C-alpha cells in the first residue's frame, strides 16, 4: 500500500531534519558591535541588564594636527529562513502522500 510513496516519505524526512539542523546550529540573534573600540569581557556580562549602550569612537590624530573619528555602529541581527517556500513544499509532500494513498 505504501510501496509507491516511500520516496516521498524519504523526502519529508530529509526536509524536516534539514529544518532541525537549521534550528540547532545557527544562533537566533546576536548584538553586533562594529568599529575600533575596547570591550572588557567582564563588562559584557552586563549586556542582559544594562539600559544604555554607549559607544565612544576612537579619535585618530594626523601628523599635521588633524583629528577625525572612527565609525562605530551597533545593533541586533537575527537569523531568518524562507518559511513560505519550505512550508509550501512540505505541505505539498504531506498532501501528495495522502492523495496517492486515498
Amino acid at each position: 500500500d505504501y510501496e509507491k510513496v516511500i520516496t516521498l516519505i524519504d523526502l519529508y524526512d530529509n526536509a524536516e531534519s534539514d529544518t532541525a539542523n537549521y534550528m540547532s546550529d545557527l544562533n537566533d540573534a546576536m548584538l553586533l558591535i562594529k568599529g575600533n573600540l575596547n570591550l572588557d569581557p567582564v563588562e559584557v556580562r552586563k549586556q542582559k541588564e544594562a539600559n544604555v549602550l554607549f559607544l565612544e569612537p576612537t579619535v585618530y590624530v594626523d601628523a599635521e594636527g588633524r583629528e577625525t573619528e572612527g565609525s562605530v555602529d551597533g545593533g541586533y541581527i537575527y537569523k531568518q529562513y524562507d518559511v513560505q517556500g519550505t512550508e509550501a513544499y512540505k505541505d505539498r509532500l504531506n498532501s501528495d502522500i495522502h492523495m496517492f494513498t486515498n
Binding site: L37, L39, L53, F54, E56, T58, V59, V61, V72
Partner: peptide
C-alpha cells in the same frame, strides 16, 4: 600634541 585615543564601549 594630542595622540590617537582609542574608543570605549560601555553598558553602564
Amino acid at each position: 600634541r594630542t595622540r590617537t585615543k582609542k574608543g570605549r564601549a560601555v553598558f553602564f
